[PDB]
Design a binder for this molecule. Structure first.
Ligand SMILES: [Mg+2]
Ligand SMILES: [Mg+2]
Ligand SMILES: [Mg+2]
Ligand SMILES: [Mg+2]
Ligand SMILES: [Mg+2]
Ligand SMILES: [Mg+2]
Ligand SMILES: [Mg+2]
Ligand SMILES: [Mg+2]
Ligand SMILES: [Mg+2]
Ligand SMILES: [Mg+2]
Ligand SMILES: [Mg+2]
Ligand SMILES: [Mg+2]
Ligand SMILES: [Mg+2]
Ligand SMILES: [Zn+2]
Ligand SMILES: [Zn+2]
Lengths: 136, 116, 50, 88, 48, 179
RNA sequence: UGGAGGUAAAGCUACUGAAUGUAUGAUGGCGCCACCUAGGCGUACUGAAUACAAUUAAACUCUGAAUGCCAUUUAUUUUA
RNA sequence: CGGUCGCCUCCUAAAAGGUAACGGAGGCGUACAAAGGUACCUUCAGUACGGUUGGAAAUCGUAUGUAGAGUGUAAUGGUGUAAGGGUGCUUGACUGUGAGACAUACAGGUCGAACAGGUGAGAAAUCAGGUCAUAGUGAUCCGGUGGUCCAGUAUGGAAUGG
RNA sequence: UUUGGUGCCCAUGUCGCUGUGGAAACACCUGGUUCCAUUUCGAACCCAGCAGUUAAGCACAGUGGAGCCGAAUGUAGCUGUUUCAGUGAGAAUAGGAAAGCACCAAGC
């Protein structure tokens, strides 16, 4: 469960995911990457599910990079609570993924295994994923 | 931390800033700069940024660095200002404490009709 | 509210013409300033008046 | 069932002080008029422009106002009142 | 600066073995005060 | 001082020849010996500090100015606005008087003067000598502070390179191990 | 046409926080010794600082628009 | 039921100003006879090296460092020759005013050139009608206190008012 | 034109490195007996003189190391109407850059 050690403000305004791709747009650490095609809010739980799935289907020498990080938190008012009396308490942390940001990258294991590994990582995420390679 | 000449420039920067902020009647500004050997004098005008009158030991040809010659230098610059028909002046030092040679030059300007 | 104000009165016409502030806790000695007086039309010593 | 609701602790705000530029560039101005109200000198004073007890810029003579950018990397703003200078 | 109660007066210092009357300014008795170990009476400064 | 004239003549010739310096005043010249007798007991026993000052006066001929800390620490009982420590900086004729008096009378009286050098220069040409006890200085009567202390005599030079500063010390015959 | 501004955007070696990998690595944990105190050789590992490559922000800014706002110049229109 | 009720700072507030919610964070009901006014002088914190007590860190010297220092305070803005620090003399923390403006439903609030009187600093020019700026505050009625060139119910006082 | 002083400017003006220079001036420098001064030091401030001096500072030539500036193309955001026309950033880059504009006094 990825989580910032401390934050200055407990309850920040939500960060929009509509728009193009700001940073993390091109594979620059590995050479295959899982790009997104639909901006959405994805939480640290989905990262851990996808990262554990990919790691289980990885090998003994493969190496991985995690680009996105859940910096921003989100709140949720408790159930059966009527409107008013202030904002709710922070519940879960979500990373803002825009259309075009490379989320996961893999290297150092043959080609066939990485496509399968990226596939299982993207089936754990709500965004519509697509595979990209690193420019020579 | 520095040398005397740099400190004199720093103090000179302080005085010039104050005068340019408060001189409302636009008088000519009589800045005197004293060195170890000689002392020179020039009357600038910060509205036009030129020098109206000037005087120096080199111009007056004296073995200066003494309080005696400061009076003559002050006398020469005051004579030039009266011919120029300017008598309301502001007097600032080059950044040195107003005393000794500087005082003789300043006092010399005062007895011949200058207003400062 | 707290009352830290104090009065300064002339010592010639014994008229109170100014209102100032004073800390009795920190500064213990009575003020003996010199201010303008409307009556005497000059500067004169003003002392604290109850 | 209402289940009850908590209490908010921060709902206080102050009156908005109407700062900013008052007289625009090119505007005719008489002596004694405010040109810029600010909290801390955001625009420096120049010629024929004074200062107050609230760092408020006011004119000192008749003329046309003029803003000039100055300072390191041109990050400081300065105001002046260029007199009519009609001079026949 | 001046106008002090402690006057810096040139007092001479004698030593044993080698006289070496060194005159140095100090605020002490105005006479030939004898020092028992001077510079010249030290194994470090002279003498291997 | 007659040795001051000796300083002029001797330092000029030898230093000039040793490195072919193109000007006689390129050779280094010593400026000021700062003395810093500072003690933290003035936070509690202020009286003690006063006596300290008088001894500093009696050693140099300049009354010591008491210095104040620029911070506040609870563990040391320190607080801002207090005077803890006096510093004296001698110039002109008096500093050379103190220097010669130190090396010839006070310094060789040190209980065990084995000396220390080469490991004292700060890299900019300065030099500090850490004295252990004050009683060794002749200008002090037996009656003194209930606590005894040392000294922090330091030196400065016009040059910024340590080797030429060492050269000046050797020309001045400042008695340290190999330096 | 002139000007005020600090948003959208962008950037984080230009700060404040958050934060990924690689390399050199303070630091501790962990040992094995000697020494009871000054320490030493490797650390399954933690990770200061620096360099390279990459990130995040309503209450971050070394930058940074358009629109909008104010005024003036010219043309036209209405007696508001 | 719980919470709040006035004022000040930031964000939301969409680059003029203004803009709400039981929206998100904080403070105030002051402090200073110096932390005011003036003249003069002066400039970080930290870090590196070198040095008795003295230690990671007290003080000293040199160098480096462009603000992370200070500016009484909650934030914002400003300010590194400044508005920060020190010293000397002082009390303008004045009297009577006030053209012209900001912002405003009103009541109130904010800035202010300039004039007359008499002062303080300074050689003088100049500056001083409280502080680097914004919170530190409560109408009217009623009564009390000081002064007063006004009234004093026939007249002189007094009472009682102005 | 060159040196010295100063104002305007506020790094394409800086920090640093390597060399050259002084005729006059600028500077270090020589002393504290005078005016003046140190929260303590003639260090500084202030005096009266130029013996020595080109290390400094200062002034010139080189140095693209650090810092700074930065084109065109393209792109993100905007305005309209389109699902295309203007507006056009930030970042990155080729690269520039060893200041510039005026006044005065002296030999020129
Ligand atoms: Mg507000
Ligand atoms: Mg944005
Ligand atoms: Mg950052
Ligand atoms: Mg209730
Ligand atoms: Mg707007
Ligand atoms: Mg606005
Ligand atoms: Mg604050
Ligand atoms: Mg004062
Ligand atoms: Mg103040
Ligand atoms: Mg009642
Ligand atoms: Mg009657
Ligand atoms: Mg009656
Ligand atoms: Mg040279
Ligand atoms: Zn009176
Ligand atoms: Zn002997």
């Amino acid at each position: 469960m990825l989580q910032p050690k401390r934050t200055k403000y407990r309850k920040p305004h939500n960060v929009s995911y509509e728009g193009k791709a700001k940073g993390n747009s091109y594979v620059a650490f590995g050479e295959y990457g899982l790009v997104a095609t639909k901006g959405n809010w994805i939480d640290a739980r989905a990262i851990e599910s996808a990262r554990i799935a990919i790691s289980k289907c990885l090998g003994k020498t493969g190496k991985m990079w995690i680009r996105i990080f859940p910096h921003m938190s989100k709140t949720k008012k408790p159930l059966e609570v009527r409107m008013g009396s202030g904002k709710g308490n922070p519940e879960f942390w979500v990373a803002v993924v825009k259309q075009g940001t490379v989320m996961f990258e893999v290297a150092n294991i043959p080609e066939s295994q990485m496509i399968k590994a990226l596939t299982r990582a993207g089936h754990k995420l709500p965004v519509t994923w697509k595979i990209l390679k690193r420019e020579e | 931390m520095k040398t005397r000449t740099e400190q004199r420039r720093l103090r000179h920067k302080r005085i010039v800033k104050k005068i340019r902020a408060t001189n409302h009647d636009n008088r000519v500004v009589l800045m005197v700069i004293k060195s170890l050997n000689h002392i020179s004098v020039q009357a600038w005008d910060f509205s036009q940024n030129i020098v109206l009158a000037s005087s120096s030991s080199l111009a007056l040809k004296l073995k200066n660095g003494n309080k005696d010659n400061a009076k003559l230098v002050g006398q020469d610059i005051a004579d030039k200002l009266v011919k120029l028909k300017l008598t309301n002046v502001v007097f600032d030092t080059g950044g040195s404490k107003y005393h000794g040679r500087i005082a003789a030059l300043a006092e010399a300007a005062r007895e011949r009709g200058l207003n400062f | 509210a707290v009352k830290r104000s104090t009065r300064l009165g002339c010592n010639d016409c014994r008229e109170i013409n100014y209102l100032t502030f004073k800390n009795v806790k920190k500064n213990p000695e009575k003020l003996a300033l010199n201010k303008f007086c409307s009556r005497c039309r000059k500067v004169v010593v003003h002392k604290e008046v109850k | 069932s209402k289940k009850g609701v908590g209490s908010t602790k921060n709902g206080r705000d102050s009156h908005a002080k109407r700062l900013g530029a008052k007289k625009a560039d090119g505007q005719m101005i008489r002596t004694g008029q405010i040109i810029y109200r600010q909290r801390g000198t955001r625009v420096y004073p120049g010629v024929n422009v004074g200062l107050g007890s609230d760092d408020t810029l006011f004119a000192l003579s008749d003329g046309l106002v003029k803003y000039q950018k100055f300072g390191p990397k041109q990050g400081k703003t300065r105001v002046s009142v260029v007199k009519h200078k009609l001079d026949a | 600066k001046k106008d002090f109660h402690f006057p810096s007066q040139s007092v001479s210092f004698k030593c044993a073995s080698c006289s070496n009357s060194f005159t140095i300014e100090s605020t002490l008795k105005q006479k030939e005060i004898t020092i028992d170990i001077c510079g010249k009476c030290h194994p470090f400064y002279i003498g291997e | 001082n007659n040795l001051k004239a000796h300083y002029q003549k001797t330092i000029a010739k030898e230093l000039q020849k040793s490195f072919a310096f193109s000007s006689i005043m390129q050779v280094p010249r010593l400026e000021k010996i700062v003395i810093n007798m500072g003690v933290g007991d003035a936070i509690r026993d202020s009286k003690f500090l006063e006596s300290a000052l008088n001894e500093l006066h009696l050693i140099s001929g300049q009354k010591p100015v008491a210095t104040k800390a620029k911070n506040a620490i609870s563990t040391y009982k320190l607080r801002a606005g207090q005077l803890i420590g006096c510093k004296v900086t001698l110039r002109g004729e008096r500093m050379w008087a103190f220097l010669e008096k130190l090396i010839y009378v006070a310094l060789p009286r040190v209980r065990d003067f084995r000396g220390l050098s080469l490991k004292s220069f700060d890299g900019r040409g300065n030099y500090t000598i850490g004295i252990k006890e004050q009683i060794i200085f002749p200008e002090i009567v037996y009656d003194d502070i209930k606590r005894i202390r040392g000294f922090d005599v330091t030196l400065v030079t016009s040059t910024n390179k340590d080797s030429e500063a060492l050269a000046l010390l050797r020309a001045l015959n400042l008695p340290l191990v190999k330096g």
